[PDB]
């Protein structure tokens, strides 16, 4: 979910790492157990 993005110092914008987090959700799901 963005919202107007602005190139920020350095750190990829949080939008990007929110679709890694979403893919560990999934994964958990596929391992039949949470990885914390």
């Known amino acids: 979910?963005?919202?107007e993005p602005e190139?920020?110092?350095d750190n990829?914008?949080?939008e990007?790492?929110?679709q890694y987090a979403a893919?560990?959700?999934r994964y958990?799901?596929?391992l039949t157990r949470p990885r914390y």
Do not use: H, S
């Open 1 to 3: 979910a963005p919202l």
């Open 23 to 25: 893919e560990l959700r």
């Open 7 to 9: 190139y920020p110092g």
């Open 12 to 14: 990829a914008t949080p």
């Open 16 to 18: 990007q790492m929110a």
């Open 28 to 30: 958990i799901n596929m």
